[PDB]
């Protein structure tokens, strides 16, 4: 009933085959969740799950630190620049001073993602600019 396959790529965006492993990773994150947080501390950028060209997913955890690696299992370490901490700050600002279709932190793109309506980036460029938010940690989307 390739309607499963077709549909899973159709709405879940994955394949009946490429599911288990994803979940296996789903499960690995939950767990090494408390650890990774502790291990990196407040350098701790944030953490997410990426895909491997081989079409497999992989849990990445990021540090606004420098430990180019770690001892945990299945956890890929990736040294970002800003830290979930610092990032939140901007978000205080992005709110302090608040087309802007909603802003918010996002560690995959190591910064606070500001969202605006096509034809609005001018809104944000502005918005963030009034917001007092250090642009290096901002990232207008549309």
PDB file of N, CA and C in Angstrom, residues 6 14 16 19 21-22 29-30 33-34 36 39 42 44-45 50 54 58 64-65 69 75 79 91 103 127 133 139:
ATOM      1  N   UNK A   6       4.421   6.844   0.207  1.00  0.00           N
ATOM      2  CA  UNK A   6       4.108   8.118  -0.448  1.00  0.00           C
ATOM      3  C   UNK A   6       3.607   9.154   0.542  1.00  0.00           C
ATOM      4  N   UNK A  14       9.210  11.707   5.689  1.00  0.00           N
ATOM      5  CA  UNK A  14      10.189  10.670   5.996  1.00  0.00           C
ATOM      6  C   UNK A  14       9.666   9.371   5.369  1.00  0.00           C
ATOM      7  N   UNK A  16       8.739   5.184   5.541  1.00  0.00           N
ATOM      8  CA  UNK A  16       8.443   4.029   6.373  1.00  0.00           C
ATOM      9  C   UNK A  16       9.717   3.288   6.771  1.00  0.00           C
ATOM     10  N   UNK A  19      12.309   5.240   9.557  1.00  0.00           N
ATOM     11  CA  UNK A  19      11.583   5.736  10.716  1.00  0.00           C
ATOM     12  C   UNK A  19      12.191   5.266  11.993  1.00  0.00           C
ATOM     13  N   UNK A  21      15.162   4.153  13.104  1.00  0.00           N
ATOM     14  CA  UNK A  21      16.367   4.858  13.495  1.00  0.00           C
ATOM     15  C   UNK A  21      16.104   6.270  14.010  1.00  0.00           C
ATOM     16  N   UNK A  22      15.208   6.996  13.345  1.00  0.00           N
ATOM     17  CA  UNK A  22      14.876   8.362  13.777  1.00  0.00           C
ATOM     18  C   UNK A  22      14.392   8.266  15.201  1.00  0.00           C
ATOM     19  N   UNK A  29      18.100  11.229  22.417  1.00  0.00           N
ATOM     20  CA  UNK A  29      18.064  12.617  22.896  1.00  0.00           C
ATOM     21  C   UNK A  29      17.468  12.751  24.304  1.00  0.00           C
ATOM     22  N   UNK A  30      16.253  12.245  24.473  1.00  0.00           N
ATOM     23  CA  UNK A  30      15.537  12.276  25.754  1.00  0.00           C
ATOM     24  C   UNK A  30      16.497  12.012  26.906  1.00  0.00           C
ATOM     25  N   UNK A  33      19.847  13.774  27.481  1.00  0.00           N
ATOM     26  CA  UNK A  33      19.306  15.105  27.625  1.00  0.00           C
ATOM     27  C   UNK A  33      19.874  15.821  28.837  1.00  0.00           C
ATOM     28  N   UNK A  34      19.698  15.206  30.007  1.00  0.00           N
ATOM     29  CA  UNK A  34      20.181  15.760  31.279  1.00  0.00           C
ATOM     30  C   UNK A  34      21.713  15.871  31.304  1.00  0.00           C
ATOM     31  N   UNK A  36      24.226  15.895  28.560  1.00  0.00           N
ATOM     32  CA  UNK A  36      24.683  16.952  27.652  1.00  0.00           C
ATOM     33  C   UNK A  36      24.444  18.351  28.272  1.00  0.00           C
ATOM     34  N   UNK A  39      26.975  18.532  31.120  1.00  0.00           N
ATOM     35  CA  UNK A  39      28.345  18.555  30.605  1.00  0.00           C
ATOM     36  C   UNK A  39      28.859  19.822  30.004  1.00  0.00           C
ATOM     37  N   UNK A  42      26.754  26.258  30.787  1.00  0.00           N
ATOM     38  CA  UNK A  42      26.085  27.449  30.328  1.00  0.00           C
ATOM     39  C   UNK A  42      26.780  27.924  29.078  1.00  0.00           C
ATOM     40  N   UNK A  44      26.601  25.759  26.934  1.00  0.00           N
ATOM     41  CA  UNK A  44      25.629  24.960  26.211  1.00  0.00           C
ATOM     42  C   UNK A  44      24.771  25.790  25.297  1.00  0.00           C
ATOM     43  N   UNK A  45      25.017  25.623  23.996  1.00  0.00           N
ATOM     44  CA  UNK A  45      24.282  26.357  22.958  1.00  0.00           C
ATOM     45  C   UNK A  45      22.856  25.878  22.974  1.00  0.00           C
ATOM     46  N   UNK A  50      19.977  16.238  13.323  1.00  0.00           N
ATOM     47  CA  UNK A  50      20.223  16.416  11.885  1.00  0.00           C
ATOM     48  C   UNK A  50      20.247  15.122  11.105  1.00  0.00           C
ATOM     49  N   UNK A  54      23.627   9.821   4.263  1.00  0.00           N
ATOM     50  CA  UNK A  54      23.178   8.450   4.143  1.00  0.00           C
ATOM     51  C   UNK A  54      21.714   8.338   4.520  1.00  0.00           C
ATOM     52  N   UNK A  58      20.950  12.239  13.111  1.00  0.00           N
ATOM     53  CA  UNK A  58      22.041  12.258  14.052  1.00  0.00           C
ATOM     54  C   UNK A  58      21.875  13.395  15.059  1.00  0.00           C
ATOM     55  N   UNK A  64      28.616  26.812  23.292  1.00  0.00           N
ATOM     56  CA  UNK A  64      29.052  28.151  23.033  1.00  0.00           C
ATOM     57  C   UNK A  64      30.460  28.161  23.621  1.00  0.00           C
ATOM     58  N   UNK A  65      30.926  26.954  23.957  1.00  0.00           N
ATOM     59  CA  UNK A  65      32.251  26.752  24.533  1.00  0.00           C
ATOM     60  C   UNK A  65      33.399  26.428  23.567  1.00  0.00           C
ATOM     61  N   UNK A  69      34.878  18.225  21.593  1.00  0.00           N
ATOM     62  CA  UNK A  69      34.362  16.868  21.648  1.00  0.00           C
ATOM     63  C   UNK A  69      33.874  16.498  23.040  1.00  0.00           C
ATOM     64  N   UNK A  75      26.391  11.271  20.733  1.00  0.00           N
ATOM     65  CA  UNK A  75      26.194  12.703  20.766  1.00  0.00           C
ATOM     66  C   UNK A  75      27.298  13.470  19.997  1.00  0.00           C
ATOM     67  N   UNK A  79      30.590  23.076  18.262  1.00  0.00           N
ATOM     68  CA  UNK A  79      30.907  24.364  18.890  1.00  0.00           C
ATOM     69  C   UNK A  79      30.352  25.580  18.176  1.00  0.00           C
ATOM     70  N   UNK A  91      16.702  38.010  22.927  1.00  0.00           N
ATOM     71  CA  UNK A  91      15.275  37.743  22.956  1.00  0.00           C
ATOM     72  C   UNK A  91      14.558  38.529  24.043  1.00  0.00           C
ATOM     73  N   UNK A 103       9.038  36.284  16.576  1.00  0.00           N
ATOM     74  CA  UNK A 103      10.472  35.975  16.737  1.00  0.00           C
ATOM     75  C   UNK A 103      10.635  34.882  17.789  1.00  0.00           C
ATOM     76  N   UNK A 127      12.732  46.555  13.018  1.00  0.00           N
ATOM     77  CA  UNK A 127      12.299  45.970  14.284  1.00  0.00           C
ATOM     78  C   UNK A 127      13.477  45.650  15.202  1.00  0.00           C
ATOM     79  N   UNK A 133      18.761  44.787  19.764  1.00  0.00           N
ATOM     80  CA  UNK A 133      19.358  43.449  19.632  1.00  0.00           C
ATOM     81  C   UNK A 133      20.621  43.319  18.757  1.00  0.00           C
ATOM     82  N   UNK A 139      18.449  36.834  13.066  1.00  0.00           N
ATOM     83  CA  UNK A 139      18.407  36.157  11.767  1.00  0.00           C
ATOM     84  C   UNK A 139      17.034  36.163  11.073  1.00  0.00           C
TER      85      UNK A 139
END
